Amino acid sequence: VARRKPEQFIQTGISTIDVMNTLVRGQKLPIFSGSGLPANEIAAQIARQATVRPDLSGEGEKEEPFAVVFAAMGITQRELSYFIQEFERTGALSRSVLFLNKADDPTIERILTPRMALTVAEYLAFEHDYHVLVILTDMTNYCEALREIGAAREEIPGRRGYPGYMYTDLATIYERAGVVEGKKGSVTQIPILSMPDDDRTHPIPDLTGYITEGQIQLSRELHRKGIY
Amino acid sequence: RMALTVAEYLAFEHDYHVLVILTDMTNYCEALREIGAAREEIPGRRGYPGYMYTDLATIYERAGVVEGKKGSVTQIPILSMPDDDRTHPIPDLTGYITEGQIQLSRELHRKGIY
Amino acid sequence: SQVSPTRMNLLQRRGQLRLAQKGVDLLKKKRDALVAEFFGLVREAMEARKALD
Amino acid sequence: PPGGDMSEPVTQSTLRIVGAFWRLDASLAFRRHFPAINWNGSYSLFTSALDPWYRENVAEDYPELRDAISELLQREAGLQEIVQLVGPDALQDAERLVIEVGRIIREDFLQQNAYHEVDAYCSMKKAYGIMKMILAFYKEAEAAIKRGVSIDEILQLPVLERIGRARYVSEEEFPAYFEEAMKEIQGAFKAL
Amino acid sequence: MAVIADPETAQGFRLAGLEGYGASSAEEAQSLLETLVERGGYALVAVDEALLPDPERAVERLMRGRDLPVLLPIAGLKEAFQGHDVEGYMRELVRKTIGF
């Protein structure tokens, strides 16, 4: 009830999103991307082209901070430096909070650290009235850590080696976002998947369907032409 | 099982002729499963039980004529499948004890040929 | 790489057969009609031809 | 099995263990010519090791007949299809030959009745001469087309009828009917 | 039109019934054949078996579709020529449908 309809559109710097889906504050756009198709790389493109629209919405939106958050659940050596070097290329590095996780950093904290970080979002986004962009990327490595408890313990695998408490595990994460009716801050969260192949019966494409309204897919067909 | 045991006494011992018409076997088989799963019997292929066979027999095998007793029960069971595909137990099972099959055409039923 | 679903798709690959198996049944005596009557025109062709040549 | 599938245990196990599979087709059945055994869908890996013991006890040329004659069905299977759609008369005299012999194989050596008990009783000596005659009728068919003998009169020979009356006796009249029947082929391609 | 063959038989296309002025010039009379049909504005293009186009495929591969004015084999020379029976029968069955 405290959520109220999203409508304040931003520039993501691809005409394609700001027309067909027309991404707005408080909204989620999962970027469906199979395996063998990059999405960390190409996401940095959106991440640096992101900029509010204040002259078309009738009021300032640069007047209240546009900070951004990033957070990996598990990444390599090259993609570590690649990220910072694409934030250093525009100086979009400034005013960011990065709660990175790596593949050699605890395997238990791939699924703990998202939940933590999102409650540090609520403080600067809602209670200091900032427009916070959350971008959570590498959501398989999530699922790796999820798997571990799923079956080894008392919990049972209710679909594909992941617990049957799966529903909750994807609820507290995803639910964070939506325009407030009494705050003027928002949490706009944009999950970017690396879901397995082009499968739709796999847990990731599953629930994500129902949840979002707006969603976009990237495919490998035009990706070998070299169009981005 | 109720009307089963009453039926025996109708058509063989009164010399009457009964026609048993069952409908929706899917429900019969779903409910069954829950019962067996607590007696320590594992469910079967495409979840439908494997201890189905025995139990399904006992309803259908009170069909066939009887020497000297003219009246006997004629069995017509009716069951559902997604498109009449044979890729789960419900037809297979049935289709060994029972004889024949009479499937339904989409063309026909559209045009209102019944 | 790229791979299709395996229980959504289950329903479509059974129906693959209904379209395929029945489909190719009628494909056989179809083309046979046109090629059957064709022969007639090839034979009959040389009728006037030989005469008037 | 419920479909005919091999991905069920029972079939893909039996399949190697037991060496023979005898598929009957529904079409092959419906015309009233028994057996209805579909050959491309039957096999017997036994036959190999039995070929010694077949010719030894039964008859010397017995194996020689079976293996040879089966080529009829093979060049007839892909012939009926849509290659004799236009009638056999508009095809080559070597592709005709296949249905000329085809008559005797389909009205003599594959037609039988489970309603008539004088034809269903069969044994070695009866079946052996039937398959035999169709070798000796191909040997004379093919000498017919090498001389340019018409396919009107070969399809009307008394020779074909002489086979037919010898499947209506069990094995009693068979020996005397083989005395007359054999030599009749011999003097009906030589009477033309 | 544009029908050509041997000289003697070419004479009569020069008159009416058919239009023509050519005769042979090649194997299939390519000098004229190709050049002419390029425009294709002629009432009929018929190449007789007096030239004999073994590659009727040359014209089809180049035209890339047109049944309007394209050679029709006839004969064009007399030797009691009525042999386009036994020839056409075998020319059809061999490449289109089942062989003879």
UniProtKB/Swiss-Prot annotation, chain B:
Disulfide-bonded cysteines: none
Coiled-coil region list: none
Keyword tags: ATP synthesis, Hydrogen ion transport, Ion transport, Transport
Entry GO MF terms: ATP binding; proton-transporting ATP synthase activity, rotational mechanism
GO biological process terms on file: proton motive force-driven plasma membrane ATP synthesis
Top-rank taxon: Bacteria
Protein family (similarity comment): Belongs to the ATPase alpha/beta chains family.
Function per UniProt: Produces ATP from ADP in the presence of a proton gradient across the membrane. The V-type beta chain is a regulatory subunit.
Protein name, per record: V-type ATP synthase beta chain
Organism: Thermus thermophilus (strain ATCC BAA-163 / DSM 7039 / HB27)
The encoding gene: atpB
First-to-last residue of the parent protein present: 236 to 349 of 478
Curated annotation (Swiss-Prot), chain C:
Example GO BP: proton motive force-driven plasma membrane ATP synthesis
Record bears the keyword Cell membrane: no
Cleavable signal peptide: none
UniProt keywords, alphabetically: ATP synthesis, Hydrogen ion transport, Ion transport, Transport
Record bears the keyword Ion transport: yes
Molecular function terms from GO: ATP binding; proton-transporting ATP synthase activity, rotational mechanism; proton-transporting ATPase activity, rotational mechanism
Family the UniProt entry places it in: Belongs to the V-ATPase D subunit family.
Reported function: Produces ATP from ADP in the presence of a proton gradient across the membrane.
UniProt name for this protein: V-type ATP synthase subunit D
Organism per entry: Thermus thermophilus (strain ATCC BAA-163 / DSM 7039 / HB27)
Curated annotation (Swiss-Prot), chain D:
Described purpose of this protein according to its UniProt entry: Produces ATP from ADP in the presence of a proton gradient across the membrane. The V-type alpha chain is a catalytic subunit.
Family: Belongs to the ATPase alpha/beta chains family.
Protein name in UniProt: V-type ATP synthase alpha chain
Species the sequence originates in: Thermus thermophilus (strain ATCC 27634 / DSM 579 / HB8)
UniProtKB/Swiss-Prot annotation, chain E:
Keywords: ATP synthesis, Hydrogen ion transport, Ion transport, Transport
Superkingdom in the source lineage: Bacteria
GO molecular function: ATP binding; proton-transporting ATP synthase activity, rotational mechanism; proton-transporting ATPase activity, rotational mechanism
Pfam families found in the cross-reference section: ATP-synt_F
Gene Ontology BP term (one): proton motive force-driven plasma membrane ATP synthesis
Family statement drawn from the similarity comment of this UniProt entry: Belongs to the V-ATPase F subunit family.
Primary role: Produces ATP from ADP in the presence of a proton gradient across the membrane.
Name of this protein: V-type ATP synthase subunit F
Protein species of origin: Thermus thermophilus (strain ATCC 27634 / DSM 579 / HB8)
Gene, per the UniProt record: atpF
